[PDB]
Scaffold this active site. Structure first.
Site, PDB file in Angstrom:
ATOM      1  CB  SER A 131     -36.330  30.349 108.972  1.00 15.18           C
ATOM      2  OG  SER A 131     -37.623  30.877 108.949  1.00 15.18           O
TER       3      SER A 131
ATOM      4  CG  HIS B 151     -34.099  29.880 113.536  1.00 12.67           C
ATOM      5  ND1 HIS B 151     -33.439  29.428 112.419  1.00 12.67           N
ATOM      6  CD2 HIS B 151     -35.417  29.789 113.255  1.00 12.67           C
ATOM      7  CE1 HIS B 151     -34.322  29.098 111.490  1.00 12.67           C
ATOM      8  NE2 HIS B 151     -35.528  29.291 111.982  1.00 12.67           N
TER       9      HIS B 151
ATOM     10  CG  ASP C  10     -30.262  28.017 112.186  1.00 10.57           C
ATOM     11  OD1 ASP C  10     -31.276  27.332 112.441  1.00 10.57           O
ATOM     12  OD2 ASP C  10     -30.337  29.161 111.694  1.00 10.57           O
TER      13      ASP C  10
END
Ligand SMILES: O=C(O)C1=C[C@H](O)[C@@H](OS(=O)(=O)O)[C@H](O[C@H]2[C@H](O)[C@@H](NS(=O)(=O)O)[C@@H](O)O[C@@H]2COS(=O)(=O)O)O1
Ligand SMILES: *[C@@H]1O[C@H](CO)[C@@H](O)[C@H](O)[C@H]1NC(C)=O
Length: 346
Positions: free
Chosen positions: A143, A296, A251
């Site tokens: 991330s 994610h 995502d």
């Protein structure tokens, strides 16, 4: 237990988390390996004072080292368990906690934003612990950490050259850090962190953080337009270091900044078109693993071994890539709706 990574708070106490507490890194050495995995943690960001204050109340761990534990167990790509990490379980493992809220871009000594300097400091300290003898340094991240890899991988390569260690091969692995600076599904004013359009969020952030971007990308855009370099498809073409991109085609963080809340026909088309646009940006990135899932992050999750594209696991794709720098390429799903891949995580 001797497999735990152990915490080292940085000796240079002027390099800090947001609240001024020392930054640091977790480490476990492996005697029989010349491979180093340096992982950058993620967890959004904050681009103004008001939003950083809120983050400091609700997610203090991401702005301070005060309560960080002296050990942590490595998971996924940082696991020393062969069943969990079939090729790289024996590596030297480093976890760098994210406490700068700046997508690892901050480069100057209110809140301190020092992410780029934290990385520089960790690399410096590791040299004395065995990094100087490394064959491969893989700078990995998930991330905001995955974006951090794009922003810092060439800076680390240059750092090592300058310090006199040119034989170390620096490479990057960006997980869930490849975003589109796209139009939102439904416009919302930039107020809260999680629903602020990606373009405006970074425009604000880079100024508030005094953030820095890679030199090769910065020179491609006009002075003042450095925000461009936070977007993978813009930064990737000028990288010197090899970088492997792991990116869910749908995502959840992308959908959030696009002001998508989870289905009417207009939203189905928006979501389908996101997958298409992402696929287009990966067309010329052979070192990629991009499944058609709504998710994610993945690389430090224990179940990272189970996701497959074209009959190939993620650990195997990474092993194939490593070996190619010393079994297939462009592992991007062709199927076009979220969760069409049978191996998508629950
Ligand atoms: O296979 C190993 O990783 C390993 C084998 C040795 O039995 C052990 O050395 S010792 O018994 O002589 O001490 C070796 O110890 C490491 C130790 O695990 C490291 N801890 S860490 O910093 O948390 O990772 C560190 O203290 O270094 C020791 C020496 O390792 S060496 O430099 O490879 O000799 O672990
Ligand atoms: C310690 O960190 C500070 C802040 O980045 C820097 O100004 C200082 O020179 C560093 N000390 C060193 C490299 O000895």
């Amino acid at each position: 237990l001797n497999e735990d990574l152990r915490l080292h708070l940085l000796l240079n106490t002027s390099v800090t988390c947001n609240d001024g507490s020392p930054a640091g890194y977790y480490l476990k050495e492996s005697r029989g390996s010349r491979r180093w995995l340096l992982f950058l943690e993620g967890g959004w960001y904050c681009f103004n004072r008001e939003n950083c204050d809120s983050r400091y109340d609700t997610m203090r761990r991401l702005m301070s080292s005060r309560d960080w534990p002296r050990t942590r167990t490595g998971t996924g790509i940082l696991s020393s368990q062969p069943e969990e990490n079939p090729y790289w379980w024996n590596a030297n493992m480093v976890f760098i906690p994210y406490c700068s809220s700046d997508v690892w871009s901050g480069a100057s000594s209110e809140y301190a934003f020092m992410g780029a300097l934290i990385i520089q400091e960790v690399v410096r300290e590791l040299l004395g612990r065995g990094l100087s003898g490394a064959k491969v340094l893989l700078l990995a991240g998930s991330s905001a950490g995955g974006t951090g890899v794009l922003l810092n991988v060439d800076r680390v390569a240059e750092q090592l050259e300058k310090l006199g260690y040119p034989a170390i091969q620096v490479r990057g692995l960006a997980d869930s850090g490849w975003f589109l600076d796209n139009k939102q599904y439904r416009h919302t004013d930039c107020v809260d962190t999680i629903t602020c359009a990606p373009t405006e969020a970074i425009r604000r952030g880079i100024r508030y953080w005094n953030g820095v971007v890679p030199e090769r990308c910065r020179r491609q855009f006009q002075e003042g337009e450095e925000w461009n370099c936070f977007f993978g498809y813009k930064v990737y073409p000028t990288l010197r270091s090899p970088v492997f991109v792991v990116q869910w085609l749908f995502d959840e963080a992308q959908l959030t900044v696009d002001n998508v809340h989870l289905v009417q026909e207009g939203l189905r088309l928006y979501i389908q078109n996101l997958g298409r646009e992402l696929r287009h940006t990966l067309k010329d990135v052979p070192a990629s693993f991009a499944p058609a899932c709504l998710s994610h992050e993945i690389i430090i999750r224990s179940h990272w071994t189970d996701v497959q594209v074209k009959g190939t696991s993620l650990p195997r794709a990474l092993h194939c890539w490593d070996r190619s720098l010393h079994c297939p390429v462009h592992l991007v799903d062709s199927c076009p709706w979220p969760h069409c891949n049978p191996s998508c995580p629950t």
